[PDB]
Amino acid sequence: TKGTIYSITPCNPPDQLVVYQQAVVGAMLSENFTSYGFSNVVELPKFF
């Protein structure tokens, strides 16, 4: 119709998580959001 263009991002990109002493702790993500019950999402270079 007009000329606008749209990208198609995938729904669920893989997330990197960490475990220690047989429990999960911390998580490397891509979105500035607290997906799990973690109380803080420290923005860091190249990742959250």
Partner 1 sequence: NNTLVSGDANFYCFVNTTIGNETTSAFVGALPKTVREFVI
Ligand X SMILES: *[C@@H]1O[C@H](CO)[C@@H](O[C@@H]2O[C@H](CO)[C@@H](O)[C@H](O)[C@H]2NC(C)=O)[C@H](O)[C@H]1NC(C)=O
Residues at the site binding ligand X, with contacts judged by CB under 6 A: 37, 39
CB of 27 closer than 8 Å to CB of 16: yes
Give the one entry of partner 1, ligand X, none that residue 46 binds, where binding means its C-beta sits below a cut-off of 5 to 8 angstroms depending on kind. none
Which candidate, 24, 27, 25, places its Cα nearest to that of 14?
27
CA distance linking residue 6 with residue 8, whole number of Å = 7
Interacting residues toward partner 1 by CB under 8 A:
1-3
Whichever of 1 and 21 has its CB closer to ligand X, that residue is: 21
Q: Closest approach of Cβ 20 to ligand X, in Å?
A: 11
